[PDB]
Design an enzyme around this catalytic site. Structure first.
Site, short mmCIF file in Angstrom:
data_model
loop_
_atom_site.label_atom_id
_atom_site.label_comp_id
_atom_site.label_asym_id
_atom_site.label_seq_id
_atom_site.Cartn_x
_atom_site.Cartn_y
_atom_site.Cartn_z
N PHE A 1 1.78 9.82 3.61
CA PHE A 1 2.11 9.65 5.02
C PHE A 1 2.67 8.28 5.32
CE2 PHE A 1 -2.34 8.36 4.57
CZ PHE A 1 -2.30 7.12 5.20
N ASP A 2 2.57 7.32 4.44
CA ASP A 2 3.13 5.96 4.69
C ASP A 2 3.09 5.13 3.44
OD1 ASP A 2 4.21 3.83 6.00
OD2 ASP A 2 2.45 3.21 7.04
N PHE B 1 -5.80 5.10 -0.36
CA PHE B 1 -4.89 3.96 -0.30
C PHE B 1 -4.78 3.32 -1.70
CE2 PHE B 1 -5.63 4.02 4.40
CZ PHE B 1 -4.30 3.83 4.84
N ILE C 1 -8.35 -0.67 10.19
CA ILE C 1 -9.46 0.32 10.14
C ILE C 1 -10.52 -0.31 9.24
CG2 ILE C 1 -7.85 2.25 10.57
CD1 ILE C 1 -7.82 2.64 7.33
N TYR D 1 0.81 -1.21 0.00
CA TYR D 1 0.00 0.00 0.00
C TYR D 1 0.84 1.25 0.00
CZ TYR D 1 1.06 0.56 5.06
OH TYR D 1 1.70 0.76 6.28
N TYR E 1 -9.65 6.92 10.83
CA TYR E 1 -9.26 7.37 12.20
C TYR E 1 -10.20 8.40 12.77
CZ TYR E 1 -5.22 4.61 11.15
OH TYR E 1 -4.49 3.54 10.74
C1 LIG Z 1 1.08 -1.54 18.50
C2 LIG Z 1 1.79 -2.04 17.47
C3 LIG Z 1 1.95 -1.19 16.19
C4 LIG Z 1 1.26 -1.94 14.99
C5 LIG Z 1 2.07 -1.68 13.75
C6 LIG Z 1 2.24 -2.60 12.76
C7 LIG Z 1 1.73 -4.04 12.82
C8 LIG Z 1 2.94 -2.18 11.53
C9 LIG Z 1 2.08 -1.69 10.36
C10 LIG Z 1 2.98 -1.66 9.12
C11 LIG Z 1 1.46 -0.30 10.69
C12 LIG Z 1 2.13 0.96 10.21
O1 LIG Z 1 3.37 1.22 10.91
C13 LIG Z 1 4.51 1.01 10.04
C14 LIG Z 1 1.41 2.28 10.37
O2 LIG Z 1 0.37 2.27 9.38
C15 LIG Z 1 -0.16 3.59 9.07
O3 LIG Z 1 0.89 4.43 8.68
C16 LIG Z 1 -1.07 3.18 7.90
O4 LIG Z 1 -0.81 3.38 6.72
C17 LIG Z 1 -2.42 2.60 8.23
O5 LIG Z 1 -3.33 3.44 8.40
N1 LIG Z 1 -2.64 1.28 8.31
C18 LIG Z 1 -1.59 0.31 7.95
C19 LIG Z 1 -2.05 -0.60 6.85
C20 LIG Z 1 -3.44 -1.10 7.24
C21 LIG Z 1 -4.45 0.01 7.38
C22 LIG Z 1 -4.03 0.86 8.60
C23 LIG Z 1 -4.36 0.07 9.84
O6 LIG Z 1 -5.53 -0.30 10.12
O7 LIG Z 1 -3.30 -0.12 10.64
C24 LIG Z 1 -3.57 -0.66 11.96
C25 LIG Z 1 -4.07 0.45 12.88
C26 LIG Z 1 -3.12 1.57 13.30
C27 LIG Z 1 -5.25 0.20 13.43
C28 LIG Z 1 -5.89 1.02 14.47
C29 LIG Z 1 -6.12 -0.08 15.58
C30 LIG Z 1 -6.57 0.68 16.83
C31 LIG Z 1 -7.89 1.36 16.54
O8 LIG Z 1 -8.28 2.20 17.63
C32 LIG Z 1 -7.87 2.31 15.36
O9 LIG Z 1 -9.24 2.72 15.16
C33 LIG Z 1 -9.37 3.91 14.39
C34 LIG Z 1 -7.28 1.56 14.16
C35 LIG Z 1 -2.28 -1.39 12.44
C36 LIG Z 1 -2.05 -2.50 11.37
C37 LIG Z 1 -2.47 -2.04 13.88
O10 LIG Z 1 -3.30 -3.22 13.67
C38 LIG Z 1 -1.19 -2.56 14.46
C39 LIG Z 1 -0.18 -1.51 14.83
O11 LIG Z 1 -0.50 -0.30 14.96
C40 LIG Z 1 -0.86 4.16 10.32
C41 LIG Z 1 -1.40 5.57 10.14
C42 LIG Z 1 0.21 4.18 11.44
C43 LIG Z 1 0.72 2.73 11.71
O12 LIG Z 1 1.67 2.79 12.80
C44 LIG Z 1 1.57 1.75 13.79
#
Ligand SMILES: C=CC[C@@H]1/C=C(\C)C[C@H](C)C[C@H](OC)[C@H]2O[C@@](O)(C(=O)C(=O)N3CCCC[C@H]3C(=O)O[C@H](/C(C)=C/[C@@H]3CC[C@@H](O)[C@H](OC)C3)[C@H](C)[C@@H](O)CC1=O)[C@H](C)C[C@@H]2OC
Length: 113
Positions: A42-43, A105, A62, A32, A88
């Site tokens: 942003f990523d 995305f 998400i 992605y 978010y």
């Molecule tokens: C604690 C361990 C860290 C753990 C990190 C990893 C496994 C590494 C993985 C490459 C994540 C990326 O880090 C390199 C980075 O991805 C972003 O840059 C991004 O592009 C993104 O949006 N993604 C990633 C690709 C899937 C969609 C989304 C997501 O759903 O991601 C999920 C997300 C944040 C969900 C929240 C869950 C909590 C709810 O409250 C909220 O509800 C609104 C939604 C991620 C997969 C979580 O399951 C797990 C984690 O976070 C975020 C902007 C910031 C995030 O940093 C962490």
């Protein structure tokens, strides 16, 4: 462009096998690139040289990802436009995504498992 659950939009860019679709709980391997509605990136995991994996439709990512991805077949490239409530919302993510952003995305379904 198709308007799926929550008003998430799918823009098909390049086809998959039009047959292998991710099912609930399936592990998906995706590449992605995330941008805000302004084009500001942003990523990206392509930049990391490592594809992302998650089980789809169980609350690991998400909601826009949960409703969105299952509509893609293996090998396809598509663009998901996701509104705030399905991403978010009003909170955002520190230093990446502001309150209420719509996320774009570019994703590629590499493999379903
Ligand atoms: C604690 C361990 C860290 C753990 C990190 C990893 C496994 C590494 C993985 C490459 C994540 C990326 O880090 C390199 C980075 O991805 C972003 O840059 C991004 O592009 C993104 O949006 N993604 C990633 C690709 C899937 C969609 C989304 C997501 O759903 O991601 C999920 C997300 C944040 C969900 C929240 C869950 C909590 C709810 O409250 C909220 O509800 C609104 C939604 C991620 C997969 C979580 O399951 C797990 C984690 O976070 C975020 C902007 C910031 C995030 O940093 C962490």
């Amino acid at each position: 462009s198709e308007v799926i659950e929550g008003n998430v939009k799918i823009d098909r860019i390049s086809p998959g096998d039009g047959a292998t679709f991710p099912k609930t709980g399936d592990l998906v391997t995706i590449h992605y690139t995330g941008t805000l509605e302004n084009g500001q990136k942003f990523d990206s995991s392509v930049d990391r040289g490592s594809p992302f994996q998650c089980n789809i439709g169980v609350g690991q990512v998400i909601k826009g990802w949960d409703v969105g991805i299952p509509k893609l077949s293996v090998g396809e490239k598509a663009r998901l436009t996701i509104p705030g409530p399905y991403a978010y919302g009003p909170r955002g993510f520190p230093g990446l995504i502001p309150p209420n952003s719509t996320l774009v995305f570019d994703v590629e379904l590499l493999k379903v498992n």
